[PDB]
Ligand binder design. Structure first.
Ligand SMILES: [Ca+2]
Length: 241
């Protein structure tokens, strides 16, 4: 289906549906503990998915996602494509937005270390929420090299990260007419996603137990360590492995 999200008329529920639809567009190798396990490898023609986002002023950006790991590869605004300077994104450009009249290769890869350096700010200090996403879209639709990095981080957390965790989806979706600075808990989840997924996978081969504890930060700003699949983050939060 055409997976889109319109900020004009948005509600917490319409954002939840958009994120649910985005997760459903991702092929699954199978499920582990009721959580979809992403395909570890796919041929280019089956590897990328698109989602479309419209800001309050009815301006739209289309976003390319690598279905193997939910990473954002690039976006399109009108007749121009923009891809991250990284191997996976170069491949993505061979399969999506192929008919863009103009193409540009962003100055950096899609990793937070590179984007934070390019933006001069860390995720902790960049407001999220639906109004934040509207502004990021406007900022990306009228591309400017000096402002794209920060907006891309808002876009990425609003899509990929929300898709990976129900807590993140919920937290962003609840801010309909206000923004908010993400908590260390949100940052901890994003940072620990590959480590956590890997431990859940390993847990399935170890009678439900992690081989390496995963230390996280909860909503109360407290450190808490996860060691098995009975943990709330595994049973009621992570949505993709
Ligand atoms: Ca994998």
């Amino acid at each position: 289906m055409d997976v889109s999200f319109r900020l004009s008329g948005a509600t917490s529920s319409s954002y939840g549906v958009f994120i649910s639809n985005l997760r459903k567009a991702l092929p699954n190798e199978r499920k582990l503990y009721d959580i979809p396990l992403l395909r570890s490898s796919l041929p280019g023609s089956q590897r990328y998915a698109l989602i479309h986002l419209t800001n309050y002023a009815d301006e739209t950006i289309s976003v390319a996602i690598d279905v193997t790991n939910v990473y954002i590869m690039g976006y399109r605004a009108g007749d121009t494509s923009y891809f991250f300077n990284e191997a996976s994104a170069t491949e993505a450009a061979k399969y999506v937005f192929k008919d863009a009249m103009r193409k540009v290769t962003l100055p950096y890869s899609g990793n937070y270390e590179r984007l934070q350096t390019a933006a001069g700010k860390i995720r902790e200090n960049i407001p999220l929420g639906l109004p934040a996403l509207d502004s990021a879209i406007t900022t990306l639709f009228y591309y400017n090299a000096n402002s794209a990095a920060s907006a891309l981080m808002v876009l990425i957390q609003s899509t990929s990260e929300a898709a990976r965790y129900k807590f993140i989806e919920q937290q962003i979706g609840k801010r309909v007419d206000k923004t908010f600075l993400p908590s260390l808990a949100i940052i901890s989840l994003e940072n620990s996603w590959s480590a956590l997924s890997k431990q859940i996978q390993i847990a399935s081969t170890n009678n439900g137990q992690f081989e390496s504890p995963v230390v996280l930060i909860n909503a109360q700003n407290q450190r808490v360590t996860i060691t098995n699949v009975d943990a709330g983050v595994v049973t009621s939060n992570i949505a993709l492995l």
